Enzyme design. Sequence first.
Site, PDB file in Angstrom:
ATOM      1  N   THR A  68       0.812  -1.220   0.000  1.00  0.00           N
ATOM      2  CA  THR A  68       0.000   0.000   0.000  1.00  0.00           C
ATOM      3  C   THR A  68       0.837   1.258   0.000  1.00  0.00           C
ATOM      4  OG1 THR A  68      -2.016  -0.862   1.046  1.00  0.00           O
ATOM      5  CG2 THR A  68      -1.490   1.482   1.461  1.00  0.00           C
TER       6      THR A  68
HETATM    7  C1  LIG Z   1      -5.671 -13.109   9.014  1.00  0.00           C
HETATM    8  C2  LIG Z   1      -5.815 -12.874   7.510  1.00  0.00           C
HETATM    9  C3  LIG Z   1      -5.158 -11.911   6.765  1.00  0.00           C
HETATM   10  C4  LIG Z   1      -5.588 -12.059   5.430  1.00  0.00           C
HETATM   11  C5  LIG Z   1      -5.136 -11.185   4.262  1.00  0.00           C
HETATM   12  O1  LIG Z   1      -4.041 -11.223   3.835  1.00  0.00           O
HETATM   13  N1  LIG Z   1      -6.097 -10.218   3.666  1.00  0.00           N
HETATM   14  C6  LIG Z   1      -5.577  -9.429   2.584  1.00  0.00           C
HETATM   15  C7  LIG Z   1      -6.735  -8.824   1.802  1.00  0.00           C
HETATM   16  C8  LIG Z   1      -7.295  -9.704   0.657  1.00  0.00           C
HETATM   17  O2  LIG Z   1      -6.684 -10.637   0.286  1.00  0.00           O
HETATM   18  N2  LIG Z   1      -8.591  -9.335   0.067  1.00  0.00           N
HETATM   19  C9  LIG Z   1      -9.512  -9.913  -1.061  1.00  0.00           C
HETATM   20  C10 LIG Z   1     -10.785 -10.553  -0.509  1.00  0.00           C
HETATM   21  C11 LIG Z   1     -11.120 -10.036   0.722  1.00  0.00           C
HETATM   22  C12 LIG Z   1     -10.961  -8.676   0.881  1.00  0.00           C
HETATM   23  C13 LIG Z   1      -9.606  -8.174   0.373  1.00  0.00           C
HETATM   24  C14 LIG Z   1      -9.829  -7.343  -0.846  1.00  0.00           C
HETATM   25  C15 LIG Z   1      -4.784  -8.222   3.106  1.00  0.00           C
HETATM   26  O3  LIG Z   1      -5.174  -7.585   4.039  1.00  0.00           O
HETATM   27  N3  LIG Z   1      -3.539  -7.893   2.387  1.00  0.00           N
HETATM   28  C16 LIG Z   1      -2.686  -6.734   2.741  1.00  0.00           C
HETATM   29  C17 LIG Z   1      -1.227  -7.007   2.487  1.00  0.00           C
HETATM   30  C18 LIG Z   1      -3.147  -5.630   1.793  1.00  0.00           C
HETATM   31  O4  LIG Z   1      -3.183  -5.806   0.619  1.00  0.00           O
HETATM   32  N4  LIG Z   1      -3.596  -4.316   2.305  1.00  0.00           N
HETATM   33  C19 LIG Z   1      -4.018  -3.326   1.311  1.00  0.00           C
HETATM   34  C20 LIG Z   1      -5.217  -2.489   1.862  1.00  0.00           C
HETATM   35  C21 LIG Z   1      -5.024  -1.404   2.678  1.00  0.00           C
HETATM   36  C22 LIG Z   1      -6.119  -0.672   3.146  1.00  0.00           C
HETATM   37  C23 LIG Z   1      -7.402  -1.056   2.785  1.00  0.00           C
HETATM   38  F1  LIG Z   1      -8.469  -0.343   3.248  1.00  0.00           F
HETATM   39  C24 LIG Z   1      -7.598  -2.158   1.965  1.00  0.00           C
HETATM   40  C25 LIG Z   1      -6.497  -2.866   1.500  1.00  0.00           C
HETATM   41  F2  LIG Z   1      -6.617  -3.953   0.696  1.00  0.00           F
HETATM   42  N5  LIG Z   1      -6.458 -13.039   5.374  1.00  0.00           N
HETATM   43  O5  LIG Z   1      -6.601 -13.560   6.640  1.00  0.00           O
END
Ligand SMILES: Cc1cc(C(=O)N[C@@H](CC(=O)N2CCCC[C@@H]2C)C(=O)N[C@@H](C)C(=O)NCc2ccc(F)cc2F)no1
Lengths: 217, 218, 215, 215, 222, 223, 223, 222
Positions: free
Chosen positions: G1
């Site tokens: 991000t």
């Molecule tokens: C305990 C756990 C963590 C995770 C995880 O890695 N979850 C990922 C998000 C993801 O895989 N997703 C697709 C489907 C669902 C919703 C979202 C869109 C994440 O959090 N990854 C981090 C590294 C990230 O990319 N963060 C970017 C970010 C920042 C702010 C915001 F508001 C939204 C965002 F995606 N899964 O289980």
Amino acid sequence: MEQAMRERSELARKGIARAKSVVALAYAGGVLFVAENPSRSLQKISELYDRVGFAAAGKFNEFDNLRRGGIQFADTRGYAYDRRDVTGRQLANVYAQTLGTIFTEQAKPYEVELCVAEVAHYGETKRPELYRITYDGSIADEPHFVVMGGTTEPIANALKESYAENASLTDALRIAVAALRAGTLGVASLEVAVLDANRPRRAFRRITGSALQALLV
Amino acid sequence: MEQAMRERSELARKGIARAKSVVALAYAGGVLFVAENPSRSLQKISELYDRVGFAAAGKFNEFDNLRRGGIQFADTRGYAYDRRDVTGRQLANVYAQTLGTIFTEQAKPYEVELCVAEVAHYGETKRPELYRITYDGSIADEPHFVVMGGTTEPIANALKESYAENASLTDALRIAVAALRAGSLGVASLEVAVLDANRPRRAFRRITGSALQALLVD
Amino acid sequence: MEQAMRERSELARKGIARAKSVVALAYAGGVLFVAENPSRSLQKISELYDRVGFAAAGKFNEFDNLRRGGIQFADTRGYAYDRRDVTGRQLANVYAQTLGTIFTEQAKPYEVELCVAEVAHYGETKRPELYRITYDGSIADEPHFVVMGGTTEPIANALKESYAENASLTDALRIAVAALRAGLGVASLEVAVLDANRPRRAFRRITGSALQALL
Amino acid sequence: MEQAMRERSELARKGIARAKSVVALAYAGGVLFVAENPSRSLQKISELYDRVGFAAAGKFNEFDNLRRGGIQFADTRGYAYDRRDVTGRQLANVYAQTLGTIFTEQAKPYEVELCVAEVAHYGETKRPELYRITYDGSIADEPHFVVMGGTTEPIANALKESYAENASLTDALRIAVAALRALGVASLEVAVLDANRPRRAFRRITGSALQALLV
Amino acid sequence: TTIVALKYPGGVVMAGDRRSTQGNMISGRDVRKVYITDDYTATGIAGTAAVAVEFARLYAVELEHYEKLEGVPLTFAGKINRLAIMVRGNLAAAMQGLLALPLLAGYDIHASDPQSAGRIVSFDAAGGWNIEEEGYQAVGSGSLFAKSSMKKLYSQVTDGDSGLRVAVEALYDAADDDSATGGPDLVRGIFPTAVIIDADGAVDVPESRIAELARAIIESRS
Amino acid sequence: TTIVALKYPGGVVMAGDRRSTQGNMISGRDVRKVYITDDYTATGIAGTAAVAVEFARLYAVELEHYEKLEGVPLTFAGKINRLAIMVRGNLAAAMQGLLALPLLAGYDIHASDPQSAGRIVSFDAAGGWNIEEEGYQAVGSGSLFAKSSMKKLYSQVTDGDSGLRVAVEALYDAADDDSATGGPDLVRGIFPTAVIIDADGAVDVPESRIAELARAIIESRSG
Amino acid sequence: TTIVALKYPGGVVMAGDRRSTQGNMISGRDVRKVYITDDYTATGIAGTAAVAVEFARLYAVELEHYEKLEGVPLTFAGKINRLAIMVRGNLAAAMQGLLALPLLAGYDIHASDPQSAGRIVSFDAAGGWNIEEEGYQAVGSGSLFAKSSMKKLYSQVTDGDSGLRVAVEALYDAADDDSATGGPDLVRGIFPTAVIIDADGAVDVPESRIAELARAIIESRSG
Amino acid sequence: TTIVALKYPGGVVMAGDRRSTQGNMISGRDVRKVYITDDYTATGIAGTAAVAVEFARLYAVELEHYEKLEGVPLTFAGKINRLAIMVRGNLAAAMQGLLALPLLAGYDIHASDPQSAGRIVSFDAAGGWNIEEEGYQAVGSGSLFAKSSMKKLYSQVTDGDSGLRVAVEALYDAADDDSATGGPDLVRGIFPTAVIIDADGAVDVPESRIAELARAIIESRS
Ligand SMILES: Cc1cc(C(=O)N[C@@H](CC(=O)N2CCCC[C@@H]2C)C(=O)N[C@@H](C)C(=O)NCc2ccc(F)cc2F)no1
Ligand SMILES: Cc1cc(C(=O)N[C@@H](CC(=O)N2CCCC[C@@H]2C)C(=O)N[C@@H](C)C(=O)NCc2ccc(F)cc2F)no1
Ligand SMILES: Cc1cc(C(=O)N[C@@H](CC(=O)N2CCCC[C@@H]2C)C(=O)N[C@@H](C)C(=O)NCc2ccc(F)cc2F)no1
Ligand SMILES: Cc1cc(C(=O)N[C@@H](CC(=O)N2CCCC[C@@H]2C)C(=O)N[C@@H](C)C(=O)NCc2ccc(F)cc2F)no1
């Protein structure tokens, strides 16, 4: 039993009768709240949620307690579900339960009368909804206008002859202040606000000062 | 129910009627508090927050419980948010709820009347605000003065015909002392303090001793 | 409501009016407590804190209750802040609050009258302070003396006529025993003093041959 | 308010009025408890602590609850501090607090009258102490004897006419029994706080030995 | 497991394989992982069988609980928030092996266009969610194979029928490359289950149709 | 730290050093470790400075609290037991590094012979105590040095002046062998603190008397 | 991000990328990370998608909750303290991988000089905050690159539109050096999101404007 | 961090650096670590930025709370007790990295001698405290450097102006040997904050005076 409840009912009624009066009516742009309130900073009309507005008559600490509880209910439900699941019907319903419990179980009954109003969401075609909750939890679904506090029969009758649907804001306002008078009175003794169906998200608006003056004349 | 609330109302009202009198007054420099009080250390006027002050009539331990509750509420809100978010309006509002509850549910209603005052933050133009909260939670926004305790009609009349929004500290003080006498008087029988809108941060300031004497005499 | 509070007030007042009398007065050396008291082990006067003393009239178990509560308050606040933050004003304040709550909410109101006194810390110049707290939590700030228990009027008037600021320990003691009688030897008296010339703990009891010598 | 307290007072007062009587008196060898007690197994006189003894008049289950609470107090305080810190004045004080609380707060006030006595520790010279705690928590410090239960005035008079300091054991016993009639071994519970015993001063005087003394 | 969902004109389809495993051992051949959770909503769930089914059951009871209490069904957004909160509430257990990872397919009766009102919402194990704008999505051990298939086949989706075909062929590719995803069992007659939702509500797709499509894909490849 | 205590005919003396450390670093030079806990008793504590001082303050408050509530001061035995209870209560913290190991000296107004009314009570970290019958005791990191010193010097104790001399010398030996115990600082004028207790009560030894004894010890040992 | 914010004359701008990952795998191309939280404040959170969204939403709700309960919004100071308190509350979860690191942009309707009523507040995982006085800030895995880029480009910010170009460019650089930050996607038409705030309030920047700024940046860096 | 405090004839001075780090990365240049906590008291805190600021804010609120409740301010001994208690209360979190180590400087309006009414109190992480008797103290990662500088420079402290100069020079020496303490920044015009207290109260030292002192020191060392 019945004597206790007659006493509670009378204490409450006499409380509301001795209070300044309030009127909320449906008009072309949404719903209008007009309240006899000389106070500079203490309010009887209030926002509850995006399209939902609140007005009360009676003892200020008690209906303010109720206003605050209602904002708690609305914000909590909106968060745990979605904003658009919060409705006026719901809040009138919880106020009904809350005031019924208060009226049967609290040390003293609340000397309160409440009005919950909802206008349509932005761009939608939906008749405004008015609800009145009395001190004992009775709940009334009202189509055109709601009158609360003081001596209501004069004001209600005045409106009943002068109320016309789809009224403009100035027309509606003057009809409301006219009805109130039947129960000399300008910016310094009035609290006015509207649920304005034309605003995109938060419909609640206060009309004060130079604006309110302009609209009275 | 009716008789119970009846004699609760009577007990509080008559407790307050037998108590010494207190006056809060808008004047040129902020707000002036003047209370009939023979004690050197027992206080019925008090700071609440930076620009917010408190005065009470009635039973001392009860309005002192309330004063302490108010300081608790203000310091808690200021810390939870920022100091600038504490207003006199909020303290008055909380006092009306609190005293309403006390009045309907406590073994004895409180024999107290409360005034919350607030003056402008330093450098700002805002007419003072005066709030009165009675034993049952009723709350009233007042424009120029507030009179509490004892026989209030005389004092209110003296101030109504004598009041000056733009009076000096000395003038306003002698107006207030005059009105208090007309409700029936020197340093040894007075508690005087002021919310001074001229101070940078904390506006509350007591006027004691030879300074209070200086203000009374000439 | 009115019925109950009238009854509670009269029960308290009658109790106190039947109890033996106690006087506290400021004298050149500090504060003097003199209480009509026939016991040798049961005490109506007590130390609260370094420069703060306590005197009570009425039902023993009840004002002994409030005495233990005051000591609890004093020690707890002194430990939480510093010894010098403990004052007679605040002990009296909390007694006001406590008796107010007791008076309105306990099964029976307490039949007690309370006096809290403070003298200056060693080497400082501070007029003694006297506080009187009654059974309904009413509190009063007194400059010269405080009378509690039984028929207070004769004693108060006697003190009003005979009291002079800064008397001697002997003379203050005589004035006190004399005003008391108006409503008495060693074996029927409990006497103590908040001695502003003591370095830390001002409270001192005047008992036995020492008391006799000043009588 | 005054209604409830009147009824409570005279309920307890009449209850104690009907009960058999108990006397306790200081004598040359310590303190002597003599109570009228037909039972062979139910006790009105008890050890509380090393040099502290207890006697009670009135309703048995209530003064037995108080007896037990007092033993609890003494063993807890002696354990929390040292044995030597437990005094008769300490037990009398907390019995005051307790009976006051019972009197104002219990569903029915206790119908009991309590005496707490203390003799000197072995090898010391200390005048016996006698305390009397009444049903409403009132407490009294007595120099020579205490009477409790039944018709106290005949007994009090007899003793005020028959009492002699430092009397011998057999004499004090005689005078005590005499006051009580104003009664053989099978109708008497007799115990002593013996100031000549090394640690635990309390010893009952029963059966044959008791008879030899009464003879 | 592979659960797939894809938007077609005027509706959405969701389809799931029938396999349950414990390690390498096949412990079930006929489990159902796709549930009509209300009149306009289906949930497919990958993860621990017990937690998955429990999620579907609880979720349906919750949405209908709201509807009966309040007289009206939750908005689609609210339905999402309630599923997401459920997932987040299970995170602690999911870290210890009791994983439920859902995929939401709905039809939003309040949307403007009754042809683009179909909704596909993906979730992560913390309850994060995203409304899929690119037309398709999948979850489970085979979801990468299924998504890379639909990436290529999605241009063929023109109606409910072709969309269901692409859904079953995605499930087929998933089974081809992931042993924890069951392929069509022609001998036993077990096939992926599927639901299709349009303006007329959510309906179970008849097995015989999925069998037909499976035989057509199978023949196509050989 | 080193705290020492010892009996002399008709009373008791307690002295303590002034050093405060964090590892090797000297963090304090004038800390006070010996405290008049009431009119007839002093407690000195070794261990973590915050917990040591806290103990001293709370223990004093507790004794005076009992005395005010009951009209009479706790017996010496009760004083011991209360200190021991506090110590036992702290054990778990003490094992995690918040240690308070005290030493008690006082005069028992209720003892039989004013000739032998002085009391020295030592403690361990589980709250066990022992009333020392051999006339001296020490606690802290330098305690074994101070006790062997006193083992040789005690026969020289005939009154309070000699007792205070021997206690200052014990502290001096302790600082000489243990870097966490501070010796006299002649450049700054900082010397151990000392309490002397007899039938007239517990009184602080003025710094200048400790200064004098320090100089006597130094000059004795240099020539 | 990568989320960026910067002050321009009379206002603030905040922009965020659209990328969501799980390890190396791209799990989102259109996630929204910058949110109008009230009429005069925007919040952009980096970290775990779920916690970050939940924060934005609950924070907006808390601010409006205050406004409705008390008839007036919180001071900017209060708004900061409430965000900080939320972050501190999440600390333990964040140390277990549920991190939410916010960056706060706002316009203070009670500030002295409206031309510099812009406000940029940075936070750490403990709830520590600082009001940024050098005019720009960034949060997320690419915030180093974005901040160095802005260090070089900030002098070109003379108004809202050049501030928007600089913010979009910082996000570009960030995506250039950080695979966890998405660049402009011209095939799919997905671009960073941007909020801008001045006296008239906080408004979403239309995607077309960001698209033009992006294509300009790309053609610039090309032939 | 480095915070210094020193007594001068008739008052006391405290000053703190401006730097905030995360490991080697510099994360703050203008943070404030020295706070007027009441009319005659300032506290400077080293440690976790969030915890340090929280401690200063809550501490000043506690002191004022007592003042308005009881009508009189806490004795200096009481202010010490309360700050100590706050630190001991935080020991558990401090062990895990949320550290806050305070330094207290004040002017005791009840001290015997107005010229020696200045107070400096140091603390350790367990809540132990000590009233400084040798004129100066410091706290934080650079405090050993600052104290060893002041040891040499303290004989020059004859008034508030000299005291202020020696304080700023100790902060300078600290920044010279500890990368976690920020030196004066002439490019940006950021200098240590400072507060001075005498009979007239606690007052913030204007930035421009600290700057003049800074340049005089730099000049003097070139
Ligand atoms: C305990 C756990 C963590 C995770 C995880 O890695 N979850 C990922 C998000 C993801 O895989 N997703 C697709 C489907 C669902 C919703 C979202 C869109 C994440 O959090 N990854 C981090 C590294 C990230 O990319 N963060 C970017 C970010 C920042 C702010 C915001 F508001 C939204 C965002 F995606 N899964 O289980
Ligand atoms: C802690 C624990 C895990 C397991 C376990 O591995 N349980 C297996 C399931 C299994 O052996 N079973 C046969 C008998 C009972 C019912 C069920 C059908 C599983 O959960 N395996 C995982 C890997 C799996 O296959 N999940 C597929 C799946 C997804 C959604 C759904 F609804 C049903 C499913 F089987 N058991 O205990
Ligand atoms: C959890 C923790 C412990 C420590 C620590 O080791 N704190 C040191 C003391 C210290 O650095 N300080 C200066 C600032 C404050 C006051 C004090 C004087 C200590 O406790 N050291 C121990 C090993 C020690 O020296 N103890 C001697 C001692 C004994 C009794 C007493 F009352 C005072 C003492 F200093 N710091 O954090
Ligand atoms: C659990 C955790 C710790 C940290 C962390 O290291 N947080 C840094 C602070 C930081 O990166 N920040 C910029 C944006 C936000 C506000 C602040 C200014 C810190 O605490 N570093 C410590 C080592 C430090 O440098 N502390 C100096 C300091 C002392 C007192 C004070 F009041 C303020 C200070 F910055 N982050 O998460």
